[PDB]
Amino acid sequence: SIDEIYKYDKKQQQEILAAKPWTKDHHYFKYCKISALALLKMVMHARSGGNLEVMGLMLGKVDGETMIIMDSFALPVAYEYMAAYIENAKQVGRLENAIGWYHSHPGYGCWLSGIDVSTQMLNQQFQEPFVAVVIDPTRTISAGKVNLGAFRTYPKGYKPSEYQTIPLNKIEDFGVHCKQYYALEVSYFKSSLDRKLLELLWNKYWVNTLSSSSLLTNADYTTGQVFDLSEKLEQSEAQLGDKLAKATRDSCKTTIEAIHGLMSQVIKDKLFNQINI
Amino acid sequence: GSVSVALHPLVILNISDHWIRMRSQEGRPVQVIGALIGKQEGRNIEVMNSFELLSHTVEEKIIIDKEYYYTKEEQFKQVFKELEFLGWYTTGGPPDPSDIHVHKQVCEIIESPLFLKLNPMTKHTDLPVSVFESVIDIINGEATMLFAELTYTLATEEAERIGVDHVARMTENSTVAEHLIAQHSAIKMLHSRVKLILEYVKASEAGEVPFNHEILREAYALCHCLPVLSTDKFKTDFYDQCNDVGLMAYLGTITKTCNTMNQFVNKFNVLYDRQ
Amino acid sequence: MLIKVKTLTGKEIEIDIEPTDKVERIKERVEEKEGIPPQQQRLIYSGKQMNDEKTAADYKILGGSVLHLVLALRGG
Numbered sequence: 001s002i003d004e005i006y007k008y009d010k011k012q013q014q015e016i017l018a019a020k021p022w023t024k025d026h027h028y029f030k031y032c033k034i035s036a037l038a039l040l041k042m043v044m045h046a047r048s049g050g051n052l053e054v055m056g057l058m059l060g061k062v063d064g065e066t067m068i069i070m071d072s073f074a075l076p077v078a079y080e081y082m083a084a085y086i087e088n089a090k091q092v093g094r095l096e097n098a099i100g101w102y103h104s105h106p107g108y109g110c111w112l113s114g115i116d117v118s119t120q121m122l123n124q125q126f127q128e129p130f131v132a133v134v135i136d137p138t139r140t141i142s143a144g145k146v147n148l149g150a151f152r153t154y155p156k157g158y159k160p161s162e163y164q165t166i167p168l169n170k171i172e173d174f175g176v177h178c179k180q181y182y183a184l185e186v187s188y189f190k191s192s193l194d195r196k197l198l199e200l201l202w203n204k205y206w207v208n209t210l211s212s213s214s215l216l217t218n219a220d221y222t223t224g225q226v227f228d229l230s231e232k233l234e235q236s237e238a239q240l241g242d243k244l245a246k247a248t249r250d251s252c253k254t255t256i257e258a259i260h261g262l263m264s265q266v267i268k269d270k271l272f273n274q275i276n277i
Numbered sequence: 278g279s280v281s282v283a284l285h286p287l288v289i290l291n292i293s294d295h296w297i298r299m300r301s302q303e304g305r306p307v308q309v310i311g312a313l314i315g316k317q318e319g320r321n322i323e324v325m326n327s328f329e330l331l332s333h334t335v336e337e338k339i340i341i342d343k344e345y346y347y348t349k350e351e352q353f354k355q356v357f358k359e360l361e362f363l364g365w366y367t368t369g370g371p372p373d374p375s376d377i378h379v380h381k382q383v384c385e386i387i388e389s390p391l392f393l394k395l396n397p398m399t400k401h402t403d404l405p406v407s408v409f410e411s412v413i414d415i416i417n418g419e420a421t422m423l424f425a426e427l428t429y430t431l432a433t434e435e436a437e438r439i440g441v442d443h444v445a446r447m448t449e450n451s452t453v454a455e456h457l458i459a460q461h462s463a464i465k466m467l468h469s470r471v472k473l474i475l476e477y478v479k480a481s482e483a484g485e486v487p488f489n490h491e492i493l494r495e496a497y498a499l500c501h502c503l504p505v506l507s508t509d510k511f512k513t514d515f516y517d518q519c520n521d522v523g524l525m526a527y528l529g530t531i532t533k534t535c536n537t538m539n540q541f542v543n544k545f546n547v548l549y550d551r552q
Numbered sequence: 553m554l555i556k557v558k559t560l561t562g563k564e565i566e567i568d569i570e571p572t573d574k575v576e577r578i579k580e581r582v583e584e585k586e587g588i589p590p591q592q593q594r595l596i597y598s599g600k601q602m603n604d605e606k607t608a609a610d611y612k613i614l615g616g617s618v619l620h621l622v623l624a625l626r627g628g
């Protein structure tokens with residue numbers, strides 16, 4: 001039956017909030033579990049603004065080293081409207097409180113800006129569990145895959161690459177504000193049961209899958225991945241003379257995606273072209 | 278379209294999450310009530326994002342707690358400029374008299390209310406059919422209105438399509454199998470459609486069904502279109518793509534071999550030459 | 553008299569005041585509780601932001617009203 005993500009346990013949440021285990025170690029949070037509804041609403045709001053920028057809050061809880069997100073609600077926008085709409089979190093009947101904020105970067109990669117990192121610093125300083133989601137609408141529309149942006153920042157006065165596609169303009173902002181935040185591994189959870197049963201509506205499409213036009217839809221994504229892998233491997237070599245394991249994993253995922261696209265193309269060719277010859 | 282009802286896949290996920298959250302919170306499954314909004318263009322439904330509208334479910338009666346919905350109206354109007362109340366949703370099987378009472382309460386707010394009855398306990402292949410809305414039948418005496426089911430459509434936008442694809446099985450069970458099961462399902466449903474078309478053609482040939490001169494003409498056109506792009510330029514492009522993917526696989530099999538060789542020499546340097 | 557202010561995450565703080573106390577006094581009490589500057593902090597009751605000049609005459613609760621604390625950047 002698995003599940004067990006739901007059934008918000010108030011006592012455990014209060015205990016983990018009062019313990020404050022992330023104050024001692026800065027790299028406490030490493031895994032971000034976004035829900036299906038969270039992603040659906042986030043991407044819908046991100047694309048419902050086109051090239052304009054949208055932002056809202058996302059509700060969830062904390063379990064050990066993972067931060068689970070169950071819901072997300074948009075915002076009207078800096079004026080009194082946003083503050084008035086914030087009361088929705090405590091006005092409705094829901095036990096998930098609030099865990100962070102999401103905001104879109106329409107065509108500017110997935111990194112965190114200077115104002116973004118400053119707001120995240122403030123939010124972490126006075127609201128201990130907080131994460132920032134920096135999803136990109138244009139990239140997921142063009143490439144057909146969703147890129148995630150869980151980018152929790154570091155504390156002030158403390159000292160301790162993936163979507164590097166910004167050609168000219170905002171790459172300067174990327175370089176200066178790069179060590180001020182660390183990415184979180186995004187691992188999606190499906191509630192199973194009802195949603196797993198109802199996911200048959202994806203099977204209803206059956207045409208975008210049969211004609212996917214892969215390997216050209218996200219050609220720029222693969223070229224960027226290879227470009228990142230090149231200096232990842234160069235850094236692994238410099239250290240060697242485990243970054244090599246990470247470079248090997250990245251190469252394996254990129255190659256697996258390429259071979260999956262080729263397999264889809266071969267299946268389509270066998271299904272359609274090799275009939276009535 | 279004959280009845281112009283278009284549901285969005287986000288509404289179904291909203292109802293499912295609502296039902297699951299309430300079931301986990303209260304231990305047992307519990308009936309839920311909602312409020313579908315959307316855009317009306319005279320003869321169009323176009324349901325979109327739905328909100329809670331908890332109301333009350335006390336004993337056997339549903340009380341009019343619609344003041345909370347009234348407060349939620351201006352709240353959702355701030356983020357949805359072009360969206361208006363259209364109906365309400367529920368979780369259960371066939372319609373019940375309680376559903377009739379709640380629908381009567383809802384008609385006070387809006388003139389054309391819908392009634393979605395997403396069934397989560399279903400155990401049959403095709404999806405639960407959304408909304409059983411009615412034009413309200415009136416007879417002499419008591420109104421005794423019923424619901425006259427009309428068809429629905431699953432029109433979806435691009436962002437919704439990408440999100441649904443991501444939630445669906447896509448990339449313990451290996452990535453090859455997860456990638457291939459989607460193709461297997463798509464090809465299976467295409468094969469079922471083509472097989473049923475072939476069965477209709479055979480039935481028309483034998484004589485079970487009347488001879489429709491246009492269905493077989495469309496079938497002949499479909500058969501004639503079957504060899505898609507069989508050009509020499511298509512073959513050249515396909516072979517170029519295959520060679521590119523082969524090179525991209527070679528670069529990466531080399532990387533994996535280098536990684537394993539590095540591990541081997543690391544283990545070898547601490548076993549034989551202790552320096 | 554003795555009210556509670558909750559942040560978005562759900563953290564509760566219990567601050568004691570008098571009926572004639574001002575909202576600036578509320579912000580200063582929250583500052584002494586955690587350390588949030590008054591200009592980087594917004595207070596909400598019943599879904600409406602408090603004005604910074606009214607001495608809690610219509611906010612009479614007598615039973616510890618729940619206030620909502622929202623962090624905001626300086627001057628928007």
Ligand SMILES: CC(C)n1nc(C(F)F)cc1C(=O)Nc1ccc([C@H]2[C@@H](O)CCCc3cncn32)c(-c2ccccc2)c1
Binds near residue numbers: 104119623624625
């Ligand atoms: C969670 C919200 C309420 N919030 N809390 C706190 C904190 F002070 F408490 C602070 C905040 C908050 O709204 N921040 C914020 C900051 C900057 C932007 C814009 C800004 O730079 C302008 C250039 C574009 C941009 C790219 N990346 C961030 N932006 C936004 C923002 C993003 C999308 C739509 C509208 C606004 C929000």
Ligand SMILES: [Zn+2]
Binds near residue numbers: 103104105111113116
């Ligand atoms: Zn940003």
